[PDB]
Design an enzyme around this catalytic site. Structure first.
Site, PDB file in Angstrom:
ATOM      1  N   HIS B  77      -5.219  73.265 -23.328  1.00 46.21           N
ATOM      2  CA  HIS B  77      -6.605  72.448 -23.469  1.00 46.21           C
ATOM      3  C   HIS B  77      -6.444  70.935 -22.895  1.00 46.21           C
ATOM      4  CE1 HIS B  77      -4.154  72.023 -27.233  1.00 46.21           C
ATOM      5  NE2 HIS B  77      -4.840  71.187 -27.466  1.00 46.21           N
ATOM      6  N   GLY B 123      -3.826  78.534 -23.023  1.00 46.69           N
ATOM      7  CA  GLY B 123      -5.070  78.235 -23.657  1.00 46.69           C
ATOM      8  C   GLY B 123      -4.839  79.200 -24.878  1.00 46.69           C
ATOM      9  N   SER B 124      -4.345  80.322 -24.882  1.00 44.99           N
ATOM     10  CA  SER B 124      -3.781  80.895 -26.156  1.00 44.99           C
ATOM     11  C   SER B 124      -2.596  80.312 -26.304  1.00 44.99           C
ATOM     12  CB  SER B 124      -3.612  82.314 -26.102  1.00 44.99           C
ATOM     13  OG  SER B 124      -2.947  82.651 -27.393  1.00 44.99           O
ATOM     14  N   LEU B 125      -2.426  79.549 -27.619  1.00 44.61           N
ATOM     15  CA  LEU B 125      -1.404  78.628 -28.091  1.00 44.61           C
ATOM     16  C   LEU B 125      -0.171  79.429 -28.036  1.00 44.61           C
ATOM     17  CD1 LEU B 125      -3.263  75.743 -29.830  1.00 44.61           C
ATOM     18  CD2 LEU B 125      -2.198  75.602 -27.721  1.00 44.61           C
ATOM     19  N   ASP B 155       1.872  70.061 -31.398  1.00 44.87           N
ATOM     20  CA  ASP B 155       2.424  69.971 -32.523  1.00 44.87           C
ATOM     21  C   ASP B 155       1.958  70.966 -33.500  1.00 44.87           C
ATOM     22  OD1 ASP B 155       0.528  68.359 -33.091  1.00 44.87           O
ATOM     23  OD2 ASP B 155       1.717  66.923 -34.533  1.00 44.87           O
ATOM     24  N   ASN B 185       1.655  64.507 -32.191  1.00 43.63           N
ATOM     25  CA  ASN B 185       0.566  63.676 -32.177  1.00 43.63           C
ATOM     26  C   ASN B 185      -0.191  63.680 -33.647  1.00 43.63           C
ATOM     27  OD1 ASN B 185      -1.297  65.751 -32.171  1.00 43.63           O
ATOM     28  ND2 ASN B 185      -2.060  65.357 -29.938  1.00 43.63           N
ATOM     29  N   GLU B 366       8.873  90.997 -29.349  1.00 41.34           N
ATOM     30  CA  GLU B 366       8.061  91.606 -28.316  1.00 41.34           C
ATOM     31  C   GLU B 366       7.049  90.435 -27.591  1.00 41.34           C
ATOM     32  OE1 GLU B 366       8.134  92.916 -31.525  1.00 41.34           O
ATOM     33  OE2 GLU B 366       9.597  94.461 -31.134  1.00 41.34           O
ATOM     34  N   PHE B 392       4.713  99.025 -30.641  1.00 39.22           N
ATOM     35  CA  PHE B 392       5.179  97.513 -30.775  1.00 39.22           C
ATOM     36  C   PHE B 392       4.783  96.693 -29.651  1.00 39.22           C
ATOM     37  CE2 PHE B 392       8.788  99.924 -33.119  1.00 39.22           C
ATOM     38  CZ  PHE B 392       8.097  99.787 -34.156  1.00 39.22           C
TER      39      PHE B 392
HETATM   40  C1  LIG Z   1      -3.513  81.209 -30.362  1.00 40.52           C
HETATM   41  C2  LIG Z   1      -4.454  79.974 -30.527  1.00 40.52           C
HETATM   42  N1  LIG Z   1      -4.976  80.067 -31.797  1.00 40.52           N
HETATM   43  C3  LIG Z   1      -6.014  78.991 -32.010  1.00 40.52           C
HETATM   44  C4  LIG Z   1      -6.449  78.094 -30.934  1.00 40.52           C
HETATM   45  C5  LIG Z   1      -7.593  77.386 -30.933  1.00 40.52           C
HETATM   46  N2  LIG Z   1      -7.215  75.958 -30.726  1.00 40.52           N
HETATM   47  C6  LIG Z   1      -7.610  75.201 -29.584  1.00 40.52           C
HETATM   48  C7  LIG Z   1      -8.682  75.640 -28.621  1.00 40.52           C
HETATM   49  O1  LIG Z   1      -9.039  77.009 -28.697  1.00 40.52           O
HETATM   50  C8  LIG Z   1      -8.300  74.926 -27.195  1.00 40.52           C
HETATM   51  O2  LIG Z   1      -7.445  75.850 -26.418  1.00 40.52           O
HETATM   52  C9  LIG Z   1     -10.029  75.054 -29.298  1.00 40.52           C
HETATM   53  O3  LIG Z   1     -10.007  73.425 -29.203  1.00 40.52           O
HETATM   54  C10 LIG Z   1     -11.240  75.131 -28.534  1.00 40.52           C
HETATM   55  O4  LIG Z   1     -11.465  74.986 -27.148  1.00 40.52           O
HETATM   56  C11 LIG Z   1     -12.466  75.055 -29.074  1.00 40.52           C
HETATM   57  O5  LIG Z   1     -13.446  75.805 -28.616  1.00 40.52           O
HETATM   58  C12 LIG Z   1     -13.060  73.354 -29.138  1.00 40.52           C
HETATM   59  O6  LIG Z   1     -12.256  72.680 -30.037  1.00 40.52           O
HETATM   60  C13 LIG Z   1     -14.330  73.282 -29.279  1.00 40.52           C
HETATM   61  O7  LIG Z   1     -14.797  73.944 -30.483  1.00 40.52           O
HETATM   62  P1  LIG Z   1     -16.300  74.648 -30.616  1.00 40.52           P
HETATM   63  O8  LIG Z   1     -16.696  74.913 -32.106  1.00 40.52           O
HETATM   64  O9  LIG Z   1     -17.426  73.763 -29.946  1.00 40.52           O
HETATM   65  O10 LIG Z   1     -16.246  75.826 -29.630  1.00 40.52           O
HETATM   66  S1  LIG Z   1      -6.585  73.993 -29.358  1.00 40.52           S
HETATM   67  C14 LIG Z   1      -6.180  74.149 -31.280  1.00 40.52           C
HETATM   68  C15 LIG Z   1      -5.251  72.913 -31.884  1.00 40.52           C
HETATM   69  C16 LIG Z   1      -3.907  72.618 -31.032  1.00 40.52           C
HETATM   70  O11 LIG Z   1      -3.502  71.589 -31.750  1.00 40.52           O
HETATM   71  P2  LIG Z   1      -1.881  70.891 -31.332  1.00 40.52           P
HETATM   72  O12 LIG Z   1      -1.541  69.842 -32.131  1.00 40.52           O
HETATM   73  O13 LIG Z   1      -0.951  72.010 -30.824  1.00 40.52           O
HETATM   74  O14 LIG Z   1      -2.504  70.102 -29.871  1.00 40.52           O
HETATM   75  P3  LIG Z   1      -3.171  68.816 -29.507  1.00 40.52           P
HETATM   76  O15 LIG Z   1      -4.532  68.898 -29.202  1.00 40.52           O
HETATM   77  O16 LIG Z   1      -2.288  68.188 -28.594  1.00 40.52           O
HETATM   78  O17 LIG Z   1      -3.252  67.938 -30.734  1.00 40.52           O
HETATM   79  C17 LIG Z   1      -6.502  75.045 -31.629  1.00 40.52           C
HETATM   80  C18 LIG Z   1      -6.557  75.650 -33.037  1.00 40.52           C
HETATM   81  C19 LIG Z   1      -5.855  78.362 -29.515  1.00 40.52           C
HETATM   82  N3  LIG Z   1      -6.166  77.921 -28.583  1.00 40.52           N
HETATM   83  N4  LIG Z   1      -5.081  79.626 -29.690  1.00 40.52           N
HETATM   84  C1  LIG Z   2       8.386  95.155 -34.535  1.00 35.68           C
HETATM   85  C2  LIG Z   2       9.463  96.194 -34.220  1.00 35.68           C
HETATM   86  N1  LIG Z   2      10.140  96.402 -33.155  1.00 35.68           N
HETATM   87  C3  LIG Z   2      11.248  97.292 -32.905  1.00 35.68           C
HETATM   88  C4  LIG Z   2      11.589  98.206 -33.821  1.00 35.68           C
HETATM   89  C5  LIG Z   2      12.582  99.218 -33.598  1.00 35.68           C
HETATM   90  N2  LIG Z   2      13.698  99.222 -34.500  1.00 35.68           N
HETATM   91  C6  LIG Z   2      13.639  99.865 -35.518  1.00 35.68           C
HETATM   92  C7  LIG Z   2      12.921 101.326 -36.028  1.00 35.68           C
HETATM   93  O1  LIG Z   2      11.929 101.614 -35.160  1.00 35.68           O
HETATM   94  C8  LIG Z   2      13.174 101.702 -37.533  1.00 35.68           C
HETATM   95  O2  LIG Z   2      12.035 101.029 -38.224  1.00 35.68           O
HETATM   96  C9  LIG Z   2      13.941 102.319 -35.182  1.00 35.68           C
HETATM   97  O3  LIG Z   2      15.402 102.613 -35.776  1.00 35.68           O
HETATM   98  C10 LIG Z   2      13.471 103.883 -35.030  1.00 35.68           C
HETATM   99  O4  LIG Z   2      13.401 104.444 -36.211  1.00 35.68           O
HETATM  100  C11 LIG Z   2      14.252 104.608 -33.999  1.00 35.68           C
HETATM  101  O5  LIG Z   2      13.121 105.710 -33.766  1.00 35.68           O
HETATM  102  C12 LIG Z   2      15.372 105.368 -34.791  1.00 35.68           C
HETATM  103  O6  LIG Z   2      16.521 104.423 -34.313  1.00 35.68           O
HETATM  104  C13 LIG Z   2      15.763 106.709 -34.030  1.00 35.68           C
HETATM  105  O7  LIG Z   2      15.968 106.653 -32.665  1.00 35.68           O
HETATM  106  P1  LIG Z   2      15.255 107.626 -31.763  1.00 35.68           P
HETATM  107  O8  LIG Z   2      15.791 107.223 -30.048  1.00 35.68           O
HETATM  108  O9  LIG Z   2      16.066 108.986 -31.946  1.00 35.68           O
HETATM  109  O10 LIG Z   2      13.699 107.657 -31.904  1.00 35.68           O
HETATM  110  S1  LIG Z   2      14.917  99.364 -36.825  1.00 35.68           S
HETATM  111  C14 LIG Z   2      15.407  98.181 -35.549  1.00 35.68           C
HETATM  112  C15 LIG Z   2      16.707  97.548 -35.744  1.00 35.68           C
HETATM  113  C16 LIG Z   2      16.422  96.536 -37.164  1.00 35.68           C
HETATM  114  O11 LIG Z   2      17.839  95.824 -37.226  1.00 35.68           O
HETATM  115  P2  LIG Z   2      17.811  95.048 -38.501  1.00 35.68           P
HETATM  116  O12 LIG Z   2      19.333  94.066 -38.346  1.00 35.68           O
HETATM  117  O13 LIG Z   2      16.677  94.012 -38.741  1.00 35.68           O
HETATM  118  O14 LIG Z   2      18.098  95.828 -39.902  1.00 35.68           O
HETATM  119  P3  LIG Z   2      19.385  96.819 -40.209  1.00 35.68           P
HETATM  120  O15 LIG Z   2      19.215  98.136 -40.049  1.00 35.68           O
HETATM  121  O16 LIG Z   2      19.465  96.381 -41.712  1.00 35.68           O
HETATM  122  O17 LIG Z   2      20.534  96.177 -39.595  1.00 35.68           O
HETATM  123  C17 LIG Z   2      14.667  98.100 -34.480  1.00 35.68           C
HETATM  124  C18 LIG Z   2      14.798  97.399 -33.175  1.00 35.68           C
HETATM  125  C19 LIG Z   2      10.630  98.108 -34.990  1.00 35.68           C
HETATM  126  N3  LIG Z   2      10.824  99.041 -35.878  1.00 35.68           N
HETATM  127  N4  LIG Z   2       9.691  97.137 -35.411  1.00 35.68           N
HETATM  128 MG   LIG Z   3      -1.380  67.946 -32.340  1.00 40.89          MG
END
Ligand SMILES: Cc1ncc(C[n+]2c([C@](O)(CO)[C@@H](O)[C@H](O)[C@H](O)[C@H](O)COP(=O)(O)O)sc(CCOP(=O)(O)OP(=O)(O)O)c2C)c(N)n1
Ligand SMILES: Cc1ncc(C[n+]2c([C@](O)(CO)[C@@H](O)[C@H](O)[C@H](O)[C@H](O)COP(=O)(O)O)sc(CCOP(=O)(O)OP(=O)(O)O)c2C)c(N)n1
Ligand SMILES: [Mg+2]
Ligand SMILES: [Mg+2]
Ligand code: NA
Ligand code: NA
Lengths: 621, 621
Positions: B77, B123-125, B155, B185, B366, B392
């Site tokens: 923005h 624009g998606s922060l 920030d 800021n 991811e 995922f």
């Molecule tokens: C993932 C994510 N989540 C929230 C936001 C919203 N957002 C921002 C945007 O979207 C700009 O990218 C808005 O500001 C948007 O443009 C509005 O539409 C606009 O404000 C007008 O409002 P209206 O009601 O008229 O539609 S920016 C923002 C705050 C960022 O603060 P930071 O401290 O990071 O940056 P700084 O500006 O430098 O202080 C938010 C919540 C987005 N975009 N992405």
């Molecule tokens: C958001 C997200 N991203 C990745 C993963 C995958 N994953 C896990 C799951 O999915 C279990 O919840 C696999 O283990 C899954 O069950 C498999 O299918 C399985 O291993 C069998 O494999 P096959 O090839 O036969 O299908 S767990 C995991 C590692 C987690 O490690 P941590 O250190 O956090 O836990 P620890 O087990 O205590 O050491 C991953 C990458 C998931 N689920 N979610």
């Molecule tokens: Mg700020």
């Protein structure tokens, strides 16, 4: 009690024996199933034994009791050890453990709320702590009760950014009733976790995020008792150094064992080993909680009065949402509102002004916001309404997906839909949110076209189970409905009809208004069109659509401020495909948009009054 | 040069003058537009002046040059000040700045790659740092070039967990060519950012995540020159204390000004003020880079040989993916692979074994993985293939959404689709991924049904622009295609036909195989069915589907291991709705599943051979 009860050696030995029983069960169940994660269970066995049989307070025969401490298994693939503690506690029959993962059992692969002892489904890693934060916030600020919340995470899991949003939330909101236990077993699925056993670095990260952080030997029942026994004025991180596969000789601390069950011959040998360590079969009993959680009412929530909007006045549905939510908050203390630093734009600020104690500022962290809401809704303690721009709910899709697997009742209002926002451009434009929310199997999708329909949608959502989505719009449009118009989930409205209608045009939000404008254009040419407002896109009023279409020569035209896939046009098409003499034509946004004025973009992308008019003529001709 | 050039007072004054010109332009452009974020521009003005006119090295007339330093505006923005520096540098005509946000201009509301000076849309922060990490990884490890990467964040933005995934990635991978500038800021959109001006706490968080962290006065051009001038052996965080709206009297450091343009009368007064501070109109010139980035080939990537699969042999398409990707990696050094701690399950480990220098372990993160891939694909430096479980990828939908807005060419392979995974249960089951990826406007969706089609899909994806998704499956199925079968995007295959066919059954992956099994069941009853494998779900071979349907009494039956909304059935229905005598019937998964064996779940959810057979009979009858 209230005083820490400092355990004797025999209590400690009983906790060790418990941990080893939990290892044995985890192995037996996953070997019987032929799948599962025994090594991930085994690193957590002392943690589980100590939480369930020393630290926690809960009714063993009533896991959902509102007075109980909460436990969230964020590393959900350790489900077998969760099942084993609930057997050990006397809730679940021990024989049932061996039916893990069977179609004849509810001891599924990962925890799910068909289990009385489970509030939220996990299995998508990194989400449990956010739910736990919602539970703890509810406990401290809403219920104002004595229950504590405990959340067990893996170390690989800590790579998910959602975890750190929760970490930051908990310190902002001083969740001194929340404990995160980190199972630092060195290994993830396919390699060591990045930090391995660099325990200091985990400590430094937790402390930098505002938590009181304690490093323990995660296989020492005494160190765990002691660390869990002391309350803090901060959310507390118990950083437990453990070994993956602890207690399984030749597997402990080894790669290539994640998600691999022991074969039958090996399980027998290992279990004999583990069983030789157990000194008594006698089990420890759970200890019950202090019963100081308040009663919550369960009744239908009704707006205090009809909408007070006048036909012809102009209001944006985003502003009508905030007005309606605030209004609803006066009718019921159950309603809470959450927003991700967009309250001035979604108009959830109106609720904050009127009901500040029930507003939760979640900052720019949409994943966590959804998980907070899920946690707040657990055990029906609150009725949450979350809001941001609809585009940014795509940031939380996995949390939303998991919320439906969690059978959660949350309400989500996404603003700023479509190209009609104008000048910000596509990063802010929700063009895929209907696709997204329609694919969530428990969803109800409201797309209100004026301020009256928006107020009615908020009221209906509050009383509707599942994932309710309300799509609001940035620009102002006229009020077209009377304040006493009846609205219902799955009931559309015909807003323009004549006996000589040649097409049924289905639009919603800004495109409904563009369709009305097109009807006025077309009347100049002595062409009449029926105009239909779906109200809910899911479920879709298939009866009124088809009846309408039968009156307009079988022809339907859909027009939407959304991409072609998964939206209104595809919903309508799937609803009526095969019906004789029924044709469906479709106007939508065909590509990533760009900046300009709202009307200019509706024109550019083929979804304004002139595009509708042209499509109608071509069908006729 | 190479030596830091320590600026004199006059260079410092010229950088101050530059910062103030950038303030003036940001105000003028957003006042002319009637929308935008001048206060968010103004906090960053010294940062921008110093980066573009002291620190960075780039060709001002060739922003996309591969030798240039990269700049990523994560806080998108602040686009108006990005446009202003490129005018100041001589690339963009100064008059064009006043056309901000117009439909007649490409100076859109947030940066987009139609602008030569923009690589990724923001624009998606919270996403820019991950793209920047991909660019820096590419610079250090692939290009092995001298360019540096600079990423400016807000920030409030730092509340996004995706930022912290990138923070951790950069320290794991020692990105000592990467600098993050944090515009502290104090304020977000609708309230102060959580930490406000607690600069120590920002430092502690950055340091705990492995970065060299320097607190500066963000409005001191000299402190900025000095902090940017020194290279480190760590990714470096410049933590800049700034005031939102800096230099706008009565707005600096105030709430209620985010995203609000100054009115015309106020802009005139403020600009006169700012202009009175400027001591010279003379502009500083950009300095060019060292040209040591290598040439990259641009040619079609071909598999070194046909698939070597034999009909009737059994392989899971997830394993065929890993085999095919490894094979492809021998044909071209451009191919890189990324995975989120699932390489043993997606079979991307095969690529890692054979081509370890081109595999990027992204851990359980991811969102960041997708952003890394986008960054690696920028300026066509690599051809990325990311993988995890398809479920995922819902965690990364906003990154995927933004990748299409970024016109990015990335390839994503999601495994473990549908209920056919069996026992893990729904948390691991992708049932919404077709909906999701179909709604991404630049996508191509491949759903290979055997190992041959999978290899062909990998090859085609590599040479196809946009967001390519390949849906793979956990269980094994038979090879049904000859190795020399020709495959094409948008071309389906009829895999079973007879002259007496009564229904066209469309299935894919496991449901194609179930449809073949149903055909054998039905033949017992002297009923023949045509079976069609779409190959790509998007784009869908509408011609072959309709031709097929005309041969089987107009009837189509779709069967899919996916939810009803947004998948194969809805795609087919939208494609053919209105075609006379064409009917479409649909079998899919109607609700959140549960654990059991693959075949048991296909039965439970109505998408196996017996469900297909029953649906066929009912259409006939
Ligand atoms: C993932 C994510 N989540 C929230 C936001 C919203 N957002 C921002 C945007 O979207 C700009 O990218 C808005 O500001 C948007 O443009 C509005 O539409 C606009 O404000 C007008 O409002 P209206 O009601 O008229 O539609 S920016 C923002 C705050 C960022 O603060 P930071 O401290 O990071 O940056 P700084 O500006 O430098 O202080 C938010 C919540 C987005 N975009 N992405
Ligand atoms: C958001 C997200 N991203 C990745 C993963 C995958 N994953 C896990 C799951 O999915 C279990 O919840 C696999 O283990 C899954 O069950 C498999 O299918 C399985 O291993 C069998 O494999 P096959 O090839 O036969 O299908 S767990 C995991 C590692 C987690 O490690 P941590 O250190 O956090 O836990 P620890 O087990 O205590 O050491 C991953 C990458 C998931 N689920 N979610
Ligand atoms: Mg700020
Ligand atoms: Mg681990
Ligand atoms: Na609801
Ligand atoms: Na591609």
């Amino acid at each position: 009690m209230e005083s820490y009860h400092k355990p004797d050696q025999q209590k400690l030995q009983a906790l060790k024996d418990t941990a080893n029983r939990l290892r044995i069960s985890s192995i037996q169940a996953t070997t019987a199933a032929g799948s599962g994660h025994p090594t991930s269970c085994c690193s957590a066995a002392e943690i589980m034994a100590v939480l369930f049989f020393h630290t926690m307070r809960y009714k063993s025969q009533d896991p959902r009791n509102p007075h109980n401490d909460r436990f969230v298994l964020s590393k959900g693939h350790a489900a077998p050890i969760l099942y084993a503690v609930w057997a050990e506690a006397g809730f679940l029959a021990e024989a049932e453990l061996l039916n893990l993962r069977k179609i004849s059992s509810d001891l599924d692969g990962h925890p799910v709320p068909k289990q009385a002892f489970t509030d939220v489904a996990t299995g998508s890693l990194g989400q449990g702590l956010g739910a736990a934060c919602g539970m703890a916030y509810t406990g401290k600020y809403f219920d104002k009760a004595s229950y504590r919340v405990y959340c067990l995470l893996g170390d690989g899991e800590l790579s998910e950014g959602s975890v750190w949003e929760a970490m930051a939330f908990a310190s902002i909101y001083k969740l001194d009733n929340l404990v995160a236990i980190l199972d630092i077993n060195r290994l993830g699925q396919s390699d060591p976790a990045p930090l391995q056993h660099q325990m200091d670095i985990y400590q430094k990260r937790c402390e930098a995020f505002g938590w009181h952080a304690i490093i323990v030997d995660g296989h020492s029942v005494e160190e765990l008792c002691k660390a869990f026994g002391q309350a803090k004025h901060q959310p507390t991180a118990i950083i437990a150094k453990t070994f993956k596969g602890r207690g399984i000789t030749g597997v402990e601390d080894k790669e290539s064992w994640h998600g691999k069950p022991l074969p039958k011959n090996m399980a027998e040998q290992i279990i004999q080993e583990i069983y030789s360590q157990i000194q008594s079969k006698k089990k420890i009993l759970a200890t019950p909680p202090q019963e100081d959680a308040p009663s919550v009412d369960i009744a239908n929530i009704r707006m205090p009065s009809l909408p007070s909007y006048k036909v012809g006045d102009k209001i944006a549905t985003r502003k009508a949402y905030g007005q309606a939510l605030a209004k609803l908050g006066h009718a019921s203390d159950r309603i809470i509102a959450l927003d991700g630093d967009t309250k001035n734009s979604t108009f959830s600020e109106i609720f904050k002004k009127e009901h500040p104690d029930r507003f939760i500022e979640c900052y720019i962290a949409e994943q966590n916001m959804v998980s907070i809401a899920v946690g707040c809704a657990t055990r029906n303690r609150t009725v949450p309404f979350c809001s941001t721009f609809a585009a940014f709910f795509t940031r939380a899709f996995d949390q939303i997906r998991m919320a439906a697997i969690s059978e959660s009742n949350i309400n989500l209002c996404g603003s700023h839909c479509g190209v009609s926002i104008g000048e910000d451009g596509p990063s802010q434009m929700a063009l895929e949110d209907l696709a997204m929310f329609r694919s969530v199997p428990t969803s109800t999708v409201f797309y209100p076209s004026d301020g009256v329909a928006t107020e009615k949608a908020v009221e209906l959502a509050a009383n509707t189970k599942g994932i309710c989505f309300i799509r609001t719009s940035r620009p102002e449009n006229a009020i077209i409905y009377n304040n006493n118009e009846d609205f219902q989930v799955g009931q559309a409205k015909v807003v323009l009809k004549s006996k000589d209608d040649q097409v049924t045009v289905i639009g919603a939000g800004v495109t409904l208004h563009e369709a009305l404008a097109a009807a006025e254009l077309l009347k100049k040419e002595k062409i009449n069109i029926r105009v239909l407002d779906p109200f809910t896109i899911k479920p879709l009023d298939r009866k009124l659509i088809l009846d309408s279409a039968r009156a307009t020569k079988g022809r339907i035209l859909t027009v939407e401020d959304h991409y072609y896939e998964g939206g209104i046009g595809e919903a309508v098409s799937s609803a009526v495909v095969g019906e004789p003499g029924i044709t469906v034509t479709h106007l939508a946004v065909n590509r990533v948009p760009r900046s300009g004025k709202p009307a200019e973009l509706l024109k550019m992308f083929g979804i304004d009054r002139d595009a509708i008019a042209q499509a109608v003529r071509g069908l006729i001709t």
